Amino acid sequence: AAWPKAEDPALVQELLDCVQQASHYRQLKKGANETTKSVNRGTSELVILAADTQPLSIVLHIPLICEEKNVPYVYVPSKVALGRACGVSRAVIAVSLTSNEASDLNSKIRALRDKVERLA
Amino acid sequence: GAKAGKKVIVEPHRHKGVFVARGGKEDLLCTANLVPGESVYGEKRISVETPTKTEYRIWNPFRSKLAAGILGGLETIYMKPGSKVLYLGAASGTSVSHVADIVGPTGAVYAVEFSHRSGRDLINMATRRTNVIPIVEDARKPMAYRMLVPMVDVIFADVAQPDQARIVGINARLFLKQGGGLLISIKASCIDSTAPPEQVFASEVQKLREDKFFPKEQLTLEPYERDHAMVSCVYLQKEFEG
Amino acid sequence: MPSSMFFEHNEALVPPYNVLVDTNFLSRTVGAKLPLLESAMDCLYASVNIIITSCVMAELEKLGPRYRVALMIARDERWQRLTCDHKGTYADDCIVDRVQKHRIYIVATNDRDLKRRIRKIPGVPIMSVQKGKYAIERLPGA
Amino acid sequence: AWVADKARFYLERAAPELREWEEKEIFTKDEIRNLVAKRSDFEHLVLAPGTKPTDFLNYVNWERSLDRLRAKRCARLNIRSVTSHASQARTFGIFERAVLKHPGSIELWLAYLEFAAQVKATKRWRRIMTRALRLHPMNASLWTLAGRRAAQNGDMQRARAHFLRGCRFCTREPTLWLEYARCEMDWLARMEAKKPALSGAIPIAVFDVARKQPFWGPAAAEKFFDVFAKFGHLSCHERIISHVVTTMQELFPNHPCTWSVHIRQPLVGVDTPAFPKALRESLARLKAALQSTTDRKALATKMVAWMDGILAIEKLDAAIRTVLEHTKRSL
Amino acid sequence: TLSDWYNIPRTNLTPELKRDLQLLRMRDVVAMGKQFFKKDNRKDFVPEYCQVGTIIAGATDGVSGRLTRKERKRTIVEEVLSSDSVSKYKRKYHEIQEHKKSGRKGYYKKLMAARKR
RNA sequence: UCUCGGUCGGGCCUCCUCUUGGGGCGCCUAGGCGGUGUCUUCGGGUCGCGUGCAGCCUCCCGUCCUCGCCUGCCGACAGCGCUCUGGGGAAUUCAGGAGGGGAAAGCAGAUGUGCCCCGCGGCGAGACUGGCGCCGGACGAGCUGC
RNA sequence: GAGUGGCGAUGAUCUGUACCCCGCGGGGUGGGUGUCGAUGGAAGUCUGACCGGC
Numbered sequence A: 001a002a003w004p005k006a007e008d009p010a011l012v013q014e015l016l017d018c019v020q021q022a023s024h025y026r027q028l029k030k031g032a033n034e035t036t037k038s039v040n041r042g043t044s045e046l047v048i049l050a051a052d053t054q055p056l057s058i059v060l061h062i063p064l065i066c067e068e069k070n071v072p073y074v075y076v077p078s079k080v081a082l083g084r085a086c087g088v089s090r091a092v093i094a095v096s097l098t099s100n101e102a103s104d105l106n107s108k109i110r111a112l113r114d115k116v117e118r119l120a
Numbered sequence B: 001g002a003k004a005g006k007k008v009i010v011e012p013h014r015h016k017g018v019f020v021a022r023g024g025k026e027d028l029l030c031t032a033n034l035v036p037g038e039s040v041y042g043e044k045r046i047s048v049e050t051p052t053k054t055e056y057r058i059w060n061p062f063r064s065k066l067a068a069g070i071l072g073g074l075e076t077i078y079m080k081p082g083s084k085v086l087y088l089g090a091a092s093g094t095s096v097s098h099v100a101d102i103v104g105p106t107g108a109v110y111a112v113e114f115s116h117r118s119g120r121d122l123i124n125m126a127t128r129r130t131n132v133i134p135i136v137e138d139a140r141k142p143m144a145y146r147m148l149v150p151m152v153d154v155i156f157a158d159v160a161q162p163d164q165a166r167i168v169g170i171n172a173r174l175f176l177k178q179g180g181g182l183l184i185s186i187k188a189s190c191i192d193s194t195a196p197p198e199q200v201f202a203s204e205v206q207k208l209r210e211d212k213f214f215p216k217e218q219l220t221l222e223p224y225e226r227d228h229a230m231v232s233c234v235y236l237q238k239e240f241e242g
Numbered sequence C: 001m002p003s004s005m006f007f008e009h010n011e012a013l014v015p016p017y018n019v020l021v022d023t024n025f026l027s028r029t030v031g032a033k034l035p036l037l038e039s040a041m042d043c044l045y046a047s048v049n050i051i052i053t054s055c056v057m058a059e060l061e062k063l064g065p066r067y068r069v070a071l072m073i074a075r076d077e078r079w080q081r082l083t084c085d086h087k088g089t090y091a092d093d094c095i096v097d098r099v100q101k102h103r104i105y106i107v108a109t110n111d112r113d114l115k116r117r118i119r120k121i122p123g124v125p126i127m128s129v130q131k132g133k134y135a136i137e138r139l140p141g142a
Numbered sequence D: 001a002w003v004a005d006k007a008r009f010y011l012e013r014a015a016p017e018l019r020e021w022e023e024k025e026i027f028t029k030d031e032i033r034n035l036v037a038k039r040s041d042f043e044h045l046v047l048a049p050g051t052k053p054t055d056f057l058n059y060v061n062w063e064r065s066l067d068r069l070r071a072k073r074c075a076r077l078n079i080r081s082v083t084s085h086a087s088q089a090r091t092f093g094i095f096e097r098a099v100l101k102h103p104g105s106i107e108l109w110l111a112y113l114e115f116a117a118q119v120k121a122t123k124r125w126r127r128i129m130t131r132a133l134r135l136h137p138m139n140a141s142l143w144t145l146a147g148r149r150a151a152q153n154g155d156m157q158r159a160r161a162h163f164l165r166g167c168r169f170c171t172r173e174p175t176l177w178l179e180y181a182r183c184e185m186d187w188l189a190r191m192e193a194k195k196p197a198l199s200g201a202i203p204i205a206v207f208d209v210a211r212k213q214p215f216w217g218p219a220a221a222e223k224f225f226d227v228f229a230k231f232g233h234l235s236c237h238e239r240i241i242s243h244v245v246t247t248m249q250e251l252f253p254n255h256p257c258t259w260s261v262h263i264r265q266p267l268v269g270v271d272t273p274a275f276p277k278a279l280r281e282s283l284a285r286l287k288a289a290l291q292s293t294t295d296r297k298a299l300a301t302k303m304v305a306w307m308d309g310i311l312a313i314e315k316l317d318a319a320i321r322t323v324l325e326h327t328k329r330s331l
Numbered sequence E: 001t002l003s004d005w006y007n008i009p010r011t012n013l014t015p016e017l018k019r020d021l022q023l024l025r026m027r028d029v030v031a032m033g034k035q036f037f038k039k040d041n042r043k044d045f046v047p048e049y050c051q052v053g054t055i056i057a058g059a060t061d062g063v064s065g066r067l068t069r070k071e072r073k074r075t076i077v078e079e080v081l082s083s084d085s086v087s088k089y090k091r092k093y094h095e096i097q098e099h100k101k102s103g104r105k106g107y108y109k110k111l112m113a114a115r116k117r
Numbered sequence F: 001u002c003u004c005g006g007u008c009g010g011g012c013c014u015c016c017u018c019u020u021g022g023g024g025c026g027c028c029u030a031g032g033c034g035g036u037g038u039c040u041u042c043g044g045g046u047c048g049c050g051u052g053c054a055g056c057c058u059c060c061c062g063u064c065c066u067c068g069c070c071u072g073c074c075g076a077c078a079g080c081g082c083u084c085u086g087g088g089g090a091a092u093u094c095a096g097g098a099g100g101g102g103a104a105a106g107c108a109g110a111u112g113u114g115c116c117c118c119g120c121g122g123c124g125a126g127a128c129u130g131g132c133g134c135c136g137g138a139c140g141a142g143c144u145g146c
Numbered sequence G: 001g002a003g004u005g006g007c008g009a010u011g012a013u014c015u016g017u018a019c020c021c022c023g024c025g026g027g028g029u030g031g032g033u034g035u036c037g038a039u040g041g042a043a044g045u046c047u048g049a050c051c052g053g054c
C-alpha cells in the first residue's frame, strides 16, 4: 500500500533533513494523531509517513484526508530514522510539516513537494 | 458561532440551486440535501418543513474549492438543476455530493478519481445518491471511461497535477460540449513552486487559451485559501450555453 | 484587487522578467541599433523573456517593406509569440487589456499616449529607449 | 418541416403514371381526384416528423393494393403495355425511406423482406436481408429466415454462412442452434434422399460444441431431441440420436430428459410390426424409467405430455390406448 | 415557489418572521462592535422566498457546539433577548436619549421657569 | 430622333415646423396622525429577605414628564427625476422581441426487377520469377461489385 | 552457568463537570443530562335565532 515509496538514493535523505530543519523551526507536527489534526485543519504543507510500521493500517488513514485536502504525502522506510530525524527519542510513525508566509524553509518545502509531485 | 439548534432562515443565492442561510450573528452557504436525513462526512445541516422534508447541508469553503469560489464572488458556476458535470479529482465524494445536490435528481455528476480508497468512499456516497456515477480511473486516460461519460455541460477540475491543463484539455476534447463550462481550481505551489503565483495563474490561463478555451473570469480564493485561483472559462465559444 | 500588490508595488514581477514589446519600441530599437535581448538584459540585469503579441506583429507587418528589417528582427524564433483573440488588431488596447488583466508584464513603449495611459494603472514597469540604452520607469529594483 | 417541398417531389414524381391512367380508359377523372388527394395525404403523413412504422405500412399496403386494383381493372379492360414498375419502384422508395427512419423495427424489416420476396426481387432481398441482420444481429427470427430461404433457394454454403454467423451471435436462446441442426439435418435429409453425406458429423459438432455455451441445459438438450427426433428415415440418425442420448447420459445422467430420451430413443426410425414392437420397447424403457430416482414430477409431466403427445395417431391397440390413459391417471 | 431552487416557498410573512428579518438587516447593532458585517442596504429587506430552519448536528462537535434545553429558543429575536449585553443595549439607548433631549423642549421650559422665577 | 445650354416649379436633399412662463406621477423633507417603547415624578399593588422596627427588595398598574422607533399612512415650501392623445387595474383582439424545453430534427445529385454476354475492377486459394534479409514483378482456379 | 518480568508521539503532562461545611473519608444546592411519573401549573372548552325557497 506504499505506492508513493521514497527512494533511498538521497530523496529519503532530503526528506529527513527537511524534517530535522522544520523541527528546528518548530514547523513540525509529530506522530500520527497530530499529523491527522494538521491535515484535517489544513495547516499541513507536506506529510511523510513511515513504511516500517508494524501494522501499516494504523497510518493508512491519512492518505485519504491528504487526498481530500490535496497535500503531498510520501513514505520513508524507517520510523526510527524518522524518529531521530525529528529528535524525539521514540519512533515517529508519521510526520507533518507546515509553513508560514516567509521562510527559506517554505522554499525547501516547495522544492521538496515538487519532487514528491515527480513521484506521484 | 453557528451552534446546533439556532434559528436561521434560508433564502436563495444568486446561483441556481445554491442557498444561503442567514442567522443572527453569522451566515452559512448551504445546498439542498438530495438524500435527506444523512450527512456525508459529518457536517452541520438544516431541516425545515413547508408552511420532515426540506433539508440543507451546510457547505464549507475550507473543505470545498467550489464553495470557496461561490463565497469568493464568482459570476457563474455553469451548473444548475439539470446539468451534467464532469468532476475531476474526486477525493471521497464530498464536493461531489455538493455538486450532486446542485444538479439534483434530474442532473448527473460523473465523478472521476484515481485512488482506490477515495474510490471506496466515493462508492459509498455514490451508492447513496443516484445521480452521481462512480468512475475510478486515471484522468490522464479518458479513453478508459469513454464508454461511461456522455457529452457533459460542465467540467469541474480539482487535480493536483503539473499537467493539469493537458488533462482537462483531453477530457474536454472528448467529453465537453460545443461551448462548454469549465471551472478549474489552480494551486500555484503545485504547478510551479519557484515562480510567483500570479505568473503561474496567468500561464495556466494561457495554456487553456492555446488549448482553445475562452477565459471569462479569474478570482483568487484568498480569505479561505492561499495561492489558489479559480478560473471560469468556456470551451470553443465566448458565451456559455450556445 | 490583484494578487501580489502592496499599495502600488507589484511583488509579482520578479526575474525572469516578462516584457510586452510594442511596434514603437521595435522601430526605435532597430533605429537605435541596440540589440533587444542584450539591452533589456543590460537595463534590468536579469533574464527576460520578451513577448510579442500578434497585434504587434500585425502592425509591423501592416507597415510596409520600409520596415522589413524591423519585422525580420521582430520574428526572432527565440521569443514567445503571444497569440491574442480579439477583432481589432489594435496593439495599445491589446496591451492595456492584457496588463490590466494580469499585471505581471513590463511594457516596452516610447509614446506619450501609451506611457501616459499605463502610468494610470499601478505597479507596472515602462521600458523606454533613451538613444543609447533602455530605461525603466517604475520597477524599484536595479 | 419542409414536408410540402419533399412531398412535392414525390407527388410530381408520381404524376406521369396518373397521366397514363387518365389517358387510358382505366380509371376515371374523379377517381384520379380521390387518388391524387389520398397519395398526397399519405406523403404528408409519411414525411411528417412524428411518424410510425404503422404509418409506413399503411401507405405500403394502400399503394400496393392500388397496384393490384389497377392490375385487375387492367385485366377487365383487356389493356396490355401498362406496367407495375412505377408502383414497385415507388413501394421500394416507401420502404427505403421507412427503414431509413425507423431502422429498429422488425415489423418494417420483415414486411420489407416479405414484399421483396413476393415481387421476386431476390438479389435485392439478400441486400435488405444483410442490412436487417446488421441492425438486428441478436434476432433469431432474421437469422433463421435468411438461412432457411437460402437453403430452399439451394445455396447451402451461403445458408451455412448465415447460420454459422447466426450461431456466433444469437447465443442466449437455443433457438438458432435448433434451427441449424434442423436445417443441416434437413440438408442431410436431402442428401440421403438424393442417394460428407455418408458420415454427417456436422450436427454432432453442433451438439458437442454447443456443450460449451451459456444456454446448454437439460431441457434445451431435450429440445435438441425434439429437433433430431424427426426424419427417422436417414442413414445415421441412430448414430446422432445415440450420441445425444449417450452424451446426456455421460454429462447429465440423472435427469428426466435423459430418461425421456431413454424412453423415446427406439421410436426414432419408425413411423408396421416395429411400431408396437418399439412401442412396447418404450414400455420396457418406460417402466424402467418411471421408477428411476430422478425428478419424478418432471418425468411425470413429460410423460403426460408425451402420452397426450401420441393420441392423434390412428391404427393402435385400444388396450394400449386405454392403459396409457390409466397410466396418466396413475401418475 | 421557485422551480429551479427546489421549491423554496414564498415568504409566509408573519409579524415574528418580519421581526427576524428586521433583526437580520440589523445584526451589526446586535454584535455591538465585536463583529461587523457585509453592509446590505437594500430598501425592501423582506425577500421573496424564505424558509425558517435550524442547525441540526455536526458529527465532530457535540460538547460545546450545541445549544441546550434552555437555549433552543423559538425566534432569533428571542435568542438575542436571551443573550447578554441587553443592559448594554439599554445603556447605549440612554446615551442616545440623553443626547436627543439636549436642548429640545424641557431645556427651553427650564429657561422659561428660570427667567420667570 | 442624337444631344447642349438656360429657368422664382416639383421629385430628391437639407434644418426648422419638438424640447412649453404648462400638466400628471414619483423622489426628498419641516411636520401631523396612528401603532408603540423607554426616561423622569408621585401614588397605589406585589414575589421575597431581614429584626418580620428601620427598611431592603423582583415584578405589576396608573399619573406626571417628555424623548424615541415603525419596509406605517398623510405631507406644504424649496429642489430633483420620469413622463404627457394625464396616471393606474382587469378583460380580450392584433403587431413585434428575447429565452427555455421538446422533435431523427437526416430532399449532396432522388433512374423498377431478374438472368445472360461484353468492359473496368475488387476479394482470393494456389502457383512462378528479378534485384538487395527484404522489396518488387507477373500468373491464376473460383467468387463478387458496378 | 542459564530462563522471566521494564513508562512515553502505537501520545507524557497541564488549564476546567461547581462552590461551600468538616476530619485521602463524609454532607447543602448544582447545571447539563436520559428515563417513567405527577395530582401540580400555563389552561379556560366557541357564538346562540334565524336562514333557504318562491
Ligand SMILES: [Zn+2]
Residues within 6 Å of the ligand: C053, C054, C055, C084, C085, C086, C089, C090, C094
Ligand atoms: Zn491582441
